[PDB]
Each structure stands twice: as C-alpha cells, then as structure tokens.
C-alpha cells in the first residue's frame, strides 16, 4: 500500500521500528480557527445527542453505512441508548460529535466522534481522546470525505489542549501499536448456523448443540449484579488489575460508574461478593447486535473488562458465558488481549475473521503483543 494521507500525519510508518517513547510533534501554540473545507454542497454540524431526533439521525446513518464483516452479511445495529453510553461519558463535548450534513437537504451523511480519556501507555499517563464512529454515507464515499473528517476532529481536539489520541481499525494503517484478534463463543448454535454466522463443522446439529450446552446458573459464589455501593471497589479492583498491561485507561470513580454501572441492553457487570462481604472479582460485557442482511437481528455480547483476585479467570468467564446465555445472546465475543488467551480455547471460543488494530496518534513507542493491550473500545 501507499498511504497518501497518513504520510502527512504525525504517525510512524509501517516499516519503522520504534525504540523511543514520546510525541512525534510538539503541542501547538496556535491552532487553526476555521473548519476545514468540505466539498461543495456539504457543511459541518455538531450533533447534540440530547435531541432524540438528532440521535435518531445518527444511528440511522451508522446502522446503514457503518462497518460490516468481510462478507457483507452483518452490520452493527447500534441502539440510541447505546450511543448515548458510548458518546456521553464524563467530559464529553458536543463539538466532538462532528457531523457532516448536506447543505440543502440537511441530511446526515457523515460523522466522527471523540471522547476524552486518560491513557496509560507504558510509563506515561497522557490526556488523550478516543476516536470512533468514522462513517461516510456510501453515496458520498467518492469525494474524499474521510480525510477531512479526521483533520476536523483533530483540529477540534487541539482547541481543547489535547494532542494525543487512541483509535482502532480493522485495516492496517501506519502504524499499529498492537494487533488483537476476535474470538467467538457460540451460545445459540442453531441460529448462528441458520444465518450463516458459523458453519456446521462432520458434526450433526445434535453434536454441535451438546458441545456448546451451558449450565442453567453460574457456579461462582456471591455472584450478583453490580450496584451503586460497588462503584468504589470496582474502581479499585480495575485500577490495580490494569497496572500489569502497557496500554490501559486510567478511569476516575466517575468514569467507572459510567462504563460499568449496569444498563439493560447496553452494559452488564456482575461482581463477586465473598463470604466476608468483600467484592473480589467482577466480569463485564456490553451489548451490540448486528443487522442480518438477508433472512432479523443477531444478539452479540462483547467481553469488556474482567478483573479477578480470588476467582480464577476461567471460572469467571464461564459465568459470563452462562449469564449471556441466560439473557438471550446468540454469541459471546472477546478479543485475545489482556489475559484472554488463557481461557479462549478452553471455553470453546473459535478464532474469528479479522483483527482489531490499535493505534496511537502523535505518540512514538514500541509495539506490544496483544496480551499487553488493556483497552477495550466501543
């Protein structure tokens, strides 16, 4: 490949091997004030998701034009309540919900977002932003709109004093700090084969169903949904557990509440409260269904953060599978980052299509194995 756009950006190129730790370019003393030029007929807009109609426009745009699998069958079916959870964490800005509209139609045909986050990369803690939901209407993809969306959100982030960012992609760009791989655990194998999420391996439908059968209830003592009183100890257990990885978020107790307090059809968090009344472990997974292109929806649970101090991680993730099975999910998704490679194969996960490349904008540092990534984005 040739990277016309990323060669102009403060990122190292692919062939480069990094042995340093630091920014590529300095913090900017003066930042460009006017927005970048969009092609004629389109204008910028900051999306106030507090408007149910504006939020309605966004998920309609995403669920019709956002990322699909390699085979054109499944499109992420984002919920209005889900997007509020992902795009309104502590410190969010409406200007960082960067939208593009047709000038005459006022139709939403492009979007990119940024949320603030404290990132711990190796031995440095930096105030960065998390970029997500870069989406261009398929009719518009011919006018080079994506590079403009990146430069505009970069400008709007610079105006607030932030000069680093973390983001993911399924494509290889300059230059991945870490490469993870998706794994899938079938919870409802009948339907996954129906809609061709998976294929019958020679095994009958009866043999496949028996292999993926799960107990009706979890096995761990003191397992219960997280509630308000668990917020500090969940925050405490998460900060200590993340210190072993090299790329992690540094959450405040306010951010821990946002990302982990249970919300129906959005985020689920179960804590382990032992016989002495102490919370010693917790599991979490968020909800993200996919639109089935032909003959209607695929309920998928995505592993989030799973912290263990007294329960084995294998036992904890078995309960996550049981819980997700109970709640009606059809598949339990999890990356191979953090300690996930210790249970993926044992708990009958299957390796998936393609990777999730992790990237740092304006930060030069060595790469790390997937086992060292402690960051999960929405």
């Amino acid at each position: 490949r040739s990277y016309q756009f990323w060669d102009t950006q403060p990122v190292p190129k692919l062939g480069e091997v990094v042995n340093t730790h630091g920014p590529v370019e300095p913090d900017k003393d003066n930042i460009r004030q006017e927005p970048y030029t969009l092609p004629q007929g389109f204008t910028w807009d900051a999306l106030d998701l507090g408007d149910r109609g504006v939020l309605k426009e966004l998920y309609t745009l995403l669920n019709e034009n956002y990322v699909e699998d390699d085979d054109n069958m499944f499109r992420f079916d984002y919920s209005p309540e889900f997007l509020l959870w992902a795009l309104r964490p502590p410190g969010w800005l409406p200007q960082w919900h960067c939208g593009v509209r047709v000038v005459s139609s006022r139709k939403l045909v492009g979007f990119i977002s940024a949320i603030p986050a404290n990132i711990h990369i190796y031995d440095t803690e930096k105030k960065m932003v998390e970029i997500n939901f870069l989406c261009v209407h398929k009719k518009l993809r011919s006018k080079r709109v994506a590079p403009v969306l990146i430069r505009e959100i970069t400008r709007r982030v610079h105006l607030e004093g932030i000069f680093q960012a973390v983001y993911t992609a399924g494509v290889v760009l300059p230059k991945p700090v870490g490469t993870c791989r998706y794994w899938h655990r079938s919870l409802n194998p009948r339907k996954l084969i129906e809609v061709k999420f998976s294929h019958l391996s020679n095994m009958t439908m009866q043999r496949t169903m028996k292999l993926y059968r799960l107990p009706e209830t979890p096995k761990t003592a003191g397992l219960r949904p997280m509630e308000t009183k668990d917020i500090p100890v969940v925050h405490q257990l998460l900060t200590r557990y993340l210190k072993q990885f090299h790329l992690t978020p540094v959450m405040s107790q306010e951010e821990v509440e946002h990302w982990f307090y249970p919300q129906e059809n959005i985020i689920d968090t179960f804590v382990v409260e032992n016989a002495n009344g102490e919370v010693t472990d917790f599991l979490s997974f968020y909800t993200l269904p996919s639109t089935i292109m032909n003959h209607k929806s695929l309920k998928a649970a995505y592993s989030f953060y799973n912290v263990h101090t007294q329960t084995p991680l294998l036992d904890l993730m078995s309960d996550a599978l049981v819980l997700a099975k109970m709640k009606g999910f059809d598949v339990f998704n999890a990356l191979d980052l953090m300690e996930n490679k210790t249970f993926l194969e044992k708990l009958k996960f299957g390796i998936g299509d393609g990777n999730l490349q992790y990237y740092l904008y304006n930060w030069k540092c060595p790469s790390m194995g997937a086992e060292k990534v402690g960051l999960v984005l929405q």
């Binding site: 699998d69 079938s186 998976s198 999730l356």
Partner: peptide, 8 residues
C-alpha cells in the same frame, strides 16, 4: 472504528 468479525 471497530471491525465486525465472524467465525472463520
């Protein structure tokens, strides 16, 4: 952006 993976 997140990628949509499927069992290979």
């Amino acid at each position: 952006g997140k990628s949509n993976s499927k069992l290979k």
